[PDB]
Amino acid sequence: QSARMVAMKAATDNAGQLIKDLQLIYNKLRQAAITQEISEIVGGAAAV
Amino acid sequence: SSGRIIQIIGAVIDVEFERTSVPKIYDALQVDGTETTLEVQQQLGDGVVRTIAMGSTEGLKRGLTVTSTNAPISVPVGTATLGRIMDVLGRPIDEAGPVATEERLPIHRQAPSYAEQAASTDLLETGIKVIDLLCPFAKGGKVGLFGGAGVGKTVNMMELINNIAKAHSGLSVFAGVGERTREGNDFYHEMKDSNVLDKVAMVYGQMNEPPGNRLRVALTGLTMAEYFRDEKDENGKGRDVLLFVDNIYRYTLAGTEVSALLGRMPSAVGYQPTLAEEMGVLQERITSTKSGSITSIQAVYVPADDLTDPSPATTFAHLDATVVLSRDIASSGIYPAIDPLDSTSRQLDPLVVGQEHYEIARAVQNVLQRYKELKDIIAILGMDELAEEDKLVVYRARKIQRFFSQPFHVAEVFTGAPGKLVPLKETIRGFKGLLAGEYDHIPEQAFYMVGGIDEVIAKAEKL
Amino acid sequence: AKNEGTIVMVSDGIVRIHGLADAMYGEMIEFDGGLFGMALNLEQDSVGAVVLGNYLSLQEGQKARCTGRVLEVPVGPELLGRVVDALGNPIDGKGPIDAKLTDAVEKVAPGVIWRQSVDQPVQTGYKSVDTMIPVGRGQRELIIGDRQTGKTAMAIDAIIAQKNSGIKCVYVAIGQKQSTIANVVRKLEETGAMAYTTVVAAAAADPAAMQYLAPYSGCTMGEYFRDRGEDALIIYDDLSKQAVAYRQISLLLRRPPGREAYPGDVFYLHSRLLERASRVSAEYVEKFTNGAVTGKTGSLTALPIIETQAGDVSAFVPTNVISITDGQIFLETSLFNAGIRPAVNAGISVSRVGGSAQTKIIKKLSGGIRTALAQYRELAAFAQFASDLDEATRKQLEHGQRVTELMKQKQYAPYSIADQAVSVYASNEGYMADVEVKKIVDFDAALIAYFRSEYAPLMKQIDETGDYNKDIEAAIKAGIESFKATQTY
Ligand SMILES: Nc1ncnc2c1ncn2[C@@H]1O[C@H](COP(=O)(O)OP(=O)(O)OP(=O)(O)O)[C@@H](O)[C@H]1O
Ligand SMILES: [Mg+2]
């Protein structure tokens, strides 16, 4: 039982840390994504 | 001399003047026969000026005359604005009559120069134990309020408004940028009911208003606060002034909308190209001159829970203290509800505040962090099963948590208990005594809503 | 001659006119074949105007004439029970509307000094939203969810549940298939809710200008009862389609682009519309009517609806409109498939007005349900490991399961205040601790039907008064005990 505790505890901790890093990546992509479309849209405004 | 509208597209309006008499940037114009005002925003060729109207363009046609004021938007400044509600143009919206002040000031002005800065950094005493001890404020500083609704955000604002006038004989100015009308009415009526309206001046820019109104509503409050600061009483000494910003994120959003309306290449994350400059225009006029000081309290909203977003990133470069309100503490029953571990201040250093204050604050923060680390072990492994020092840390942390709470003065007409303003020295002495261990036998229930330390002793011996 | 021009360009439903020098922004214009247009761009040497109708009959070189008036709609109580286009022309074929007066479509909300605190309740018939997310007269609550997630159902149920309240209702449909609108109208007429409801429809085949101007006309028609002291409710079925139509018009008019190609003035579009749902004070009603009505306060409640793609609430328009409203109701796609038919997510849905918009008995009895739901959210993974917990936590989990199954309800069956009160009282006390987890829905109705047949006086008193005194509590307890003793489910 005690051993399971420790093992399970570790998992939870790891999961928590994992989430954090993913969040960071997500935010980056989000910002990056937006910028791209704007540029393309601006290109359309110059297409005429 | 006079102009005429030549183009109407939404809010953007193009006006044509004479070859010579072309109004400068940021000048204010007024369309005759209508209650419409325009703000110069860009200068083009052939004496054509691109402006944004403060108001609505419905029922407007090309060929209407325009008269130039040859000056920026001027607002009335004085002591007759204490207890009134005005819009961006300084017009009453409370149906209480015209403001008797006859002297006006422009809202566009350069920041004070390099040689006009204060020769030292002096702390500001508020009377709230937790704010003074762990997030000390500075005359000319800036505080960012991170909190949701239902955590007592307005009550704290009113308490600070009362405390400054009671202690430092100062005044306050409130500016609402893009606020809801319902909450504005509620706030005004709460101020009237609590009797703090007399010491404050209020300016509202509504959410249903065009972005031009919401963008230029903070400068009016800034101008009023600046006039309050430089008023010289006998023997000079100026005055200390508070300024309030209901939300600064909406200021940046209004700037973005205005930039998009005028038409220019978007920056990263769709922000306008001139973001940091626009914010530094606002945040560099809030400082402590030789005559007196202005301190600003601003509410900050983080979009998409992203601290890396350009708007909060630009905001955080000017903030000196951060006050965080947590729902967890409010449920626990400890008001005011300010987190003592997520709240930070740049003035908490041994140089500005001293050595003993720094030591006491760091010790309290360390004890709180230790308690935060130990709760989980008690929760899962079990109660007790631990050495004595941990248990002593837990008991002291609980006593400190109870001791942080204090009654306020703006709630006297509701609960009936008088408010307590605690001088810093009393807080320092009480916390040092608690950390020493003298009050290791006093019941913790005497630390709740009890104000100063001696008062704790009296409540304990009475019980 | 300043009141006559010519057409020089026709394309994609937009006509450019050369003339009309004294033409105002938003003024209506008359095309040759009994057609109307709205001006939106006043350039140096041309006027941009959208056509409110079929532009395929317009050709270059035709004439135009300015009306001299802003866009207006007929307003009155004679529009109740009728279906009309965005401009007031009937489409149900039941005859002309005997209009008495007209009102402008673009108007400004009342100032901050004329408002009033929201303290009166509005019922929708759903226990989950009536006890957790109260809606008051003058509030602004938003329903947001993915496709086929239950959004329209809830709006129609809210409209239906005003049978015995005296609140008028306006229903605006934007960019929908005509068959769906016909089915909705038929269902409304079948129940009997069409005796006090107005319907404005702009189908998917209609011009984008109509789909863009429909909600403003609907709000103008709903503002009639606010100024005269009598309450009203308005529902916009999709603001997303209005935003799409606005984007199309702006892009076709060459306004500068932005994130997702939306124009700059898009937040203002919904801001100036949603801010008109307010509760005015008695002084405003006294002044507007010139002393005809005294001591009465008006209101207007709004229930906008927004659709999100794949749950991306971070999009431009959902974020724009979330920051404007006073609350949010979130409907999940996973909960709909899992069997929770109303599919309301508790945990991310909030009401800013709160408990100030409830009756006495509902306000007293909502706390137990809120606490039980919170505790069930706290501990739910322990369902498999129930036997290993102590008695208190196991009891908490069982109570949470019973409560979360009590929230399920069927379509077209609005609950009354007495019904909700009886159900909540039976739950807050220990009465529903013996029934099985799977049979709670059957037990709840049987209990409701036992009342209204043996205790109807009491139900009428609760419905008409809303008070809560020791006497009512005793009657409710005695009735519940009698039902549990004698009848069977
Ligand atoms: N409370 C309910 N209980 C059971 N079924 C329901 C309930 N509410 C809606 N439904 C059904 O689930 C489906 C959802 O349709 P509905 O019109 O409510 O969704 P919607 O969000 O408006 O969709 P759309 O995006 O297609 O307009 C329909 O078949 C409807 O009959
Ligand atoms: Mg739908």
Side-chain angles (χ1 to χ4, degrees):
Chain A
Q1 303 310 313
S2 70
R4 200 158 295 131
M5 179 194 291
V6 178
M8 299 308 309
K9 168 164 71 65
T12 78
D13 292 8
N14 287 9
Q17 177 50 51
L18 194 42
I19 291 174
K20 300 290 180 67
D21 61 55
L22 290 174
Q23 297 276 8
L24 295 175
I25 301 166
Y26 176 78
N27 293 124
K28 295 179 183 179
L29 289 164
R30 189 179 65 83
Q31 282 164 244
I34 291 164
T35 303
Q36 320 200 336
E37 289 91 8
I38 289 164
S39 73
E40 294 179 353
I41 297 168
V42 169
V48 307
Chain B
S1 66
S2 302
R4 56 199 298 103
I5 301 168
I6 64 168
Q7 212 165 284
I8 298 175
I9 297 152
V12 190
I13 297 171
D14 298 10
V15 186
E16 174 166 353
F17 283 93
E18 205 263 333
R19 314 292 289 102
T20 63
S21 76
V22 180
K24 279 166 308 307
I25 306 293
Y26 290 165
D27 267 17
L29 311 175
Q30 64 180 20
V31 171
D32 317 325
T34 306
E35 293 177 350
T36 174
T37 189
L38 289 75
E39 169 186 46
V40 169
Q41 212 77 5
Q42 180 176 339
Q43 197 145 344
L44 300 175
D46 205 350
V48 173
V49 179
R50 185 159 281 178
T51 73
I52 288 174
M54 296 297 103
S56 74
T57 57
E58 261 95 358
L60 280 183
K61 64 179 180 180
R62 301 176 304 221
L64 287 173
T65 82
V66 168
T67 303
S68 164
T69 59
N70 273 276
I73 294 169
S74 278
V75 296
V77 287
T79 189
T81 61
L82 275 155
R84 313 287 310 258
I85 311 172
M86 307 138 286
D87 50 340
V88 177
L89 278 75
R91 295 180 294 174
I93 59 167
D94 44 11
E95 288 298 284
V99 192
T101 290
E102 84 286 342
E103 56 180 359
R104 292 178 174 88
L105 274 196
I107 73 164
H108 292 103
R109 185 177 290 113
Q110 314 297 297
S113 69
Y114 176 71
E116 316 180 41
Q117 310 286 324
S120 66
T121 44
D122 207 329
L123 278 76
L124 192 147
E125 182 179 0
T126 61
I128 302 168
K129 317 187 252 176
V130 64
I131 280 189
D132 286 346
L133 178 76
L134 297 168
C135 183
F137 294 178
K139 300 196 183 136
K142 298 177 183 67
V143 182
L145 206 56
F146 294 94
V151 296
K153 218 175 61 61
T154 60
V155 190
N156 293 318
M157 288 175 128
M158 291 198 295
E159 177 71 14
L160 287 171
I161 294 180
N162 174 226
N163 264 357
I164 177 170
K166 181 176 285 188
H168 303 251
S169 313
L171 307 176
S172 297
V173 185
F174 188 89
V177 191
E179 216 192 352
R180 304 187 180 79
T181 315
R182 205 183 46 90
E183 293 181 352
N185 199 266
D186 275 18
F187 190 68
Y188 168 62
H189 272 297
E190 209 171 5
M191 269 187 167
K192 196 147 51 84
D193 283 0
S194 185
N195 217 8
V196 285
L197 180 58
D198 37 8
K199 292 182 292 297
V200 76
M202 270 177 314
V203 182
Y204 280 164
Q206 296 297 322
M207 187 179 287
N208 58 5
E209 295 294 328
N213 296 27
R214 308 190 294 268
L215 182 62
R216 304 258 179 266
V217 71
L219 309 185
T220 306
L222 196 51
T223 288
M224 292 185 176
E226 294 187 308
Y227 180 84
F228 277 164
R229 176 197 60 199
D230 296 10
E231 261 191 353
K232 276 317 186 164
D233 51 283
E234 53 94 53
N235 316 339
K237 179 59 163 60
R239 204 159 35 193
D240 293 346
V241 179
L242 278 168
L243 174 67
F244 289 92
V245 175
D246 77 323
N247 204 0
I248 200 149
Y249 174 55
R250 290 197 289 265
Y251 172 75
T252 65
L253 290 181
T256 303
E257 296 168 13
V258 168
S259 68
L261 284 184
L262 284 155
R264 43 193 55 158
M265 296 296 173
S267 181
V269 173
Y271 282 97
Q272 70 274 21
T274 59
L275 176 83
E277 191 272 333
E278 279 184 352
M279 197 169 187
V281 165
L282 179 67
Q283 303 264 51
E284 289 296 326
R285 316 172 47 178
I286 300 172
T287 195
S288 57
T289 68
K290 298 292 180 65
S291 56
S293 178
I294 286 183
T295 53
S296 173
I297 301 164
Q298 302 168 173
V300 187
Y301 168 60
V302 179
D305 278 338
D306 192 31
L307 286 176
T308 316
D309 192 75
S311 190
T314 307
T315 306
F316 286 4
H318 299 80
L319 261 61
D320 294 332
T322 79
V323 175
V324 160
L325 280 75
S326 159
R327 216 170 278 261
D328 162 70
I329 326 188
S331 64
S332 172
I334 320 180
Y335 280 79
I338 296 150
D339 199 303
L341 293 175
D342 309 319
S343 298
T344 60
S345 162
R346 303 197 73 154
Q347 276 82 29
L348 195 58
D349 63 329
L351 265 167
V352 178
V353 69
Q355 172 70 40
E356 77 296 336
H357 190 143
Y358 185 81
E359 185 49 79
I360 296 300
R362 296 298 295 164
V364 170
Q365 264 174 337
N366 182 21
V367 168
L368 287 174
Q369 185 68 40
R370 183 81 270 177
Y371 183 46
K372 179 179 284 293
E373 293 179 353
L374 295 174
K375 63 177 172 61
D376 289 345
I377 319 171
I378 288 285
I380 313 196
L381 275 66
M383 226 294 287
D384 200 312
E385 65 199 66
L386 276 168
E388 63 185 342
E389 66 270 13
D390 289 345
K391 296 187 169 63
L392 291 179
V393 162
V394 164
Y395 301 146
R396 290 180 182 177
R398 298 178 63 83
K399 292 184 176 68
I400 298 169
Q401 289 209 264
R402 267 70 173 177
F403 196 50
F404 279 125
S405 74
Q406 80 164 52
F408 279 5
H409 293 257
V410 295
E412 289 177 353
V413 297
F414 290 166
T415 306
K420 295 298 180 50
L421 199 152
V422 188
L424 181 59
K425 300 296 289 183
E426 292 294 327
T427 75
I428 299 292
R429 282 200 307 115
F431 275 113
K432 180 172 71 176
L434 182 44
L435 283 167
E438 324 174 354
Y439 321 107
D440 273 356
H441 58 277
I442 305 297
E444 64 193 16
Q445 286 80 359
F447 291 87
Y448 182 64
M449 292 281 160
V450 64
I453 174 72
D454 47 348
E455 293 179 353
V456 175
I457 306 179
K459 186 176 184 292
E461 63 94 6
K462 189 262 182 181
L463 270 178
Chain C
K2 293 179 179 179
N3 68 298
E4 183 178 2
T6 58
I7 295 183
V8 310
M9 196 281 284
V10 178
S11 65
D12 294 328
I14 292 173
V15 171
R16 293 190 189 276
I17 297 90
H18 171 228
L20 293 178
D22 303 359
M24 292 152 18
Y25 179 91
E27 182 172 329
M28 291 187 289
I29 291 155
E30 320 166 358
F31 296 124
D32 60 332
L35 273 172
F36 283 119
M38 185 177 179
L40 294 177
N41 289 337
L42 270 75
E43 291 95 6
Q44 178 69 43
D45 275 358
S46 74
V47 175
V50 298
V51 189
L52 302 170
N54 202 32
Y55 76 109
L56 294 173
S57 50
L58 303 156
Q59 309 185 8
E60 162 187 349
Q62 295 187 335
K63 286 310 173 264
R65 206 182 161 265
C66 83
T67 53
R69 291 180 291 111
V70 288
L71 188 65
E72 274 165 23
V73 291
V75 182
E78 66 269 13
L79 277 75
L80 292 159
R82 299 293 301 275
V83 175
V84 296
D85 65 9
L87 295 179
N89 317 306
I91 71 180
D92 53 356
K94 290 182 181 179
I97 293 173
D98 308 345
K100 186 60 65 68
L101 72 164
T102 59
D103 202 9
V105 181
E106 294 265 11
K107 285 209 309 306
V108 183
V112 72
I113 200 65
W114 302 111
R115 302 307 191 80
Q116 184 71 40
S117 67
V118 167
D119 55 302
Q120 286 175 301
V122 159
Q123 313 282 343
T124 73
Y126 281 114
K127 298 186 290 293
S128 298
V129 67
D130 266 5
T131 69
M132 293 293 106
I133 305 99
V135 187
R137 327 203 164 168
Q139 209 200 320
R140 298 175 292 174
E141 196 82 24
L142 186 137
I143 320 168
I144 172 158
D146 309 305
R147 57 172 165 89
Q148 293 132 40
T149 59
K151 301 186 294 290
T152 305
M154 184 176 287
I156 291 314
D157 284 17
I159 289 173
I160 281 163
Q162 314 291 311
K163 186 181 289 293
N164 298 116
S165 286
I167 301 182
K168 311 311 179 195
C169 298
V170 186
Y171 180 83
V172 187
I174 305 101
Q176 291 182 358
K177 180 164 67 72
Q178 291 176 355
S179 314
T180 311
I181 311 182
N183 290 315
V184 169
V185 168
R186 188 178 299 117
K187 181 57 63 67
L188 280 184
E189 185 175 0
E190 188 272 332
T191 293
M194 207 80 200
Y196 50 82
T197 317
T198 300
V199 167
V200 182
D206 281 1
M210 311 294 278
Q211 318 191 16
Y212 151 74
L213 289 157
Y216 291 107
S217 60
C219 186
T220 296
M221 290 170 196
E223 281 179 338
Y224 174 88
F225 310 108
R226 198 182 30 103
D227 295 330
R228 273 88 155 164
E230 293 177 350
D231 316 338
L233 166 63
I234 177 159
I235 299 189
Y236 317 95
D237 207 283
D238 267 325
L239 293 178
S240 299
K241 295 180 176 66
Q242 180 191 5
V244 167
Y246 182 56
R247 171 174 76 180
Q248 160 180 344
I249 294 172
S250 47
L251 283 173
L252 266 296
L253 281 165
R254 305 214 76 92
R255 307 254 179 91
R259 171 184 182 188
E260 290 168 14
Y262 280 114
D265 46 356
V266 65
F267 182 86
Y268 184 39
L269 182 66
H270 286 161
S271 170
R272 67 183 179 180
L273 173 64
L274 276 179
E275 281 272 303
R276 293 158 73 170
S278 64
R279 176 179 176 179
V280 299
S281 72
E283 292 84 4
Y284 186 69
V285 190
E286 202 144 4
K287 182 176 72 174
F288 188 91
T289 68
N290 293 328
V293 180
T294 59
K296 285 184 180 178
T297 69
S299 68
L300 176 66
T301 308
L303 287 187
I305 300 187
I306 282 175
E307 175 179 356
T308 58
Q309 324 278 334
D312 194 341
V313 295
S314 292
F316 189 68
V317 169
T319 44
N320 272 4
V321 194
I322 280 172
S323 71
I324 302 176
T325 59
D326 296 330
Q328 291 96 50
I329 316 179
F330 282 103
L331 304 173
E332 292 291 326
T333 308
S334 89
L335 301 171
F336 199 73
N337 291 328
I340 312 184
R341 307 304 294 161
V344 172
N345 192 6
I348 51 155
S349 290
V350 69
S351 182
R352 271 163 162 282
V353 165
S356 178
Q358 290 172 314
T359 57
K360 287 177 66 67
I361 176 156
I362 296 307
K363 183 178 178 181
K364 292 297 293 295
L365 292 172
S366 176
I369 289 177
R370 163 176 309 281
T371 317
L373 272 190
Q375 275 141 9
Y376 174 68
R377 264 168 304 193
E378 183 178 1
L379 60 85
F382 301 84
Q384 171 194 2
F385 298 103
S387 71
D388 315 286
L389 302 170
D390 53 355
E391 297 295 327
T393 52
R394 190 183 302 171
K395 207 164 299 316
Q396 293 212 61
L397 184 50
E398 298 294 328
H399 186 65
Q401 290 181 25
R402 267 75 169 178
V403 164
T404 188
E405 201 162 336
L406 175 78
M407 294 294 105
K408 297 179 184 176
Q409 196 177 329
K410 292 189 188 315
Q411 201 181 353
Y412 302 127
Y415 271 32
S416 180
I417 312 168
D419 295 345
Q420 299 180 34
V422 167
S423 307
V424 175
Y425 192 95
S427 75
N428 292 357
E429 270 59 42
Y431 297 114
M432 295 191 189
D434 282 15
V435 294
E436 292 179 354
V437 176
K438 292 189 292 185
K439 205 147 283 307
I440 303 301
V441 196
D442 289 345
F443 174 80
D444 170 75
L447 178 58
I448 294 300
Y450 179 51
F451 294 77
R452 321 195 69 85
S453 177
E454 272 72 24
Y455 305 96
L458 169 68
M459 299 293 104
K460 202 176 74 59
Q461 174 178 4
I462 290 190
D463 278 18
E464 295 286 345
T465 67
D467 284 345
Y468 192 41
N469 47 64
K470 293 179 179 179
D471 289 345
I472 289 179
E473 170 173 359
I476 288 186
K477 184 177 179 180
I480 292 186
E481 295 255 21
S482 162
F483 179 76
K484 281 257 289 192
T486 74
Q487 278 87 20
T488 59
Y489 58 97

